[PDB]
Amino acid sequence: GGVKVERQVFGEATKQPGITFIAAKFDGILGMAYPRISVNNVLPVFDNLMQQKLVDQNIFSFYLSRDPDAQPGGELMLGGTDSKYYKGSLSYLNVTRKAYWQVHLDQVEVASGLTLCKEGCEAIVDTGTSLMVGPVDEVRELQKAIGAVPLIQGEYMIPCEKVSTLPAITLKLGGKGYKLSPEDYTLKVSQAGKTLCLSGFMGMDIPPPSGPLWILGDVFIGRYYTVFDRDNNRVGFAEAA
């Protein structure tokens, strides 16, 4: 297997400001959102794939491993699903605005009682964001309800020792509740090391006109195997195995 997407326009980066890519282990980015948010209306790679009729189903799925010492680290499957990485059945949600993979979140409930996004809100499913992110005010309430402390700039830390005492947080998507236990939403980090767990929710306000928006990053896609469907503009989730 291997696909050859022919005649793809892509950018050759000549200036890349700041620290942000000095620290990145990857060389570049292959964006997989819809064409509306494409700089210079350059047809995306998967749009090019669909057009050259290179796969049977115009879908692609993401399995991401949440243990960094695991082989493989995750698996993107183009044009299909890989049932060796999820349990049960896919439950789908329709894309509300066709630009990012935008889905409607019904509410975020942290089991100690607090319910955020009551009234419902808009969320995007982004494999390029590590953490879950939400509006600064709701995420500070959520962090206080779980007892994490501020690190800096919307990120919070919790003692890794303290993780088993923590609440589970449930995001309710399309009527179903998807549960993140304390081990799903906290990341172990090191320099001196360990005992330092990040709280997996970052508080960041995304301005109108696109925002506000919650972002369901790799923290969520790591518990729930994700299916992006270009044929029917919907997202599907199942418990990752």
């Binding site: 892509f10 292959l30 964006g31 997989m32 210079n40 044009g79």
Partner: protein, 97 residues
């Protein structure tokens, strides 16, 4: 059939996989980002100011027989990083095959 791309996992924070640009394929690692829609890799003509480019793989157009120039400039600002360069055309392979 479905095409499997194996991803590497750096610290549960960065997941990236390998792809090729050009004939013959020059291999790069990219994050398959469902939050954007552009594809970009470092140019071998990246400026000295681009420190990031010194430590990554850079694409060389003159080593690809299927390269078609475009030259149009582009500027992408992520909610974190910013970059710019010019656009180009060539084959993309996934995996580096």
């Amino acid at each position: 059939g479905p095409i499997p791309e194996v991803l590497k996992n750096y610290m549960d924070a960065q997941y990236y996989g390998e792809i090729g640009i050009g004939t013959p394929p020059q291999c790069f690692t990219v994050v398959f980002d469902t939050g954007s829609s552009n594809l970009w890799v470092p140019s071998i003509h990246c400026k000295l100011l681009d420190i990031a480019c010194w430590i990554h793989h850079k694409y060389n157009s003159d080593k690809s027989s299927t390269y078609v120039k475009n030259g149009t400039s582009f500027d992408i600002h992520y909610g974190s990083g910013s970059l710019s360069g010019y656009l180009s055309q060539d084959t993309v392979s996934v995996p580096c095959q």
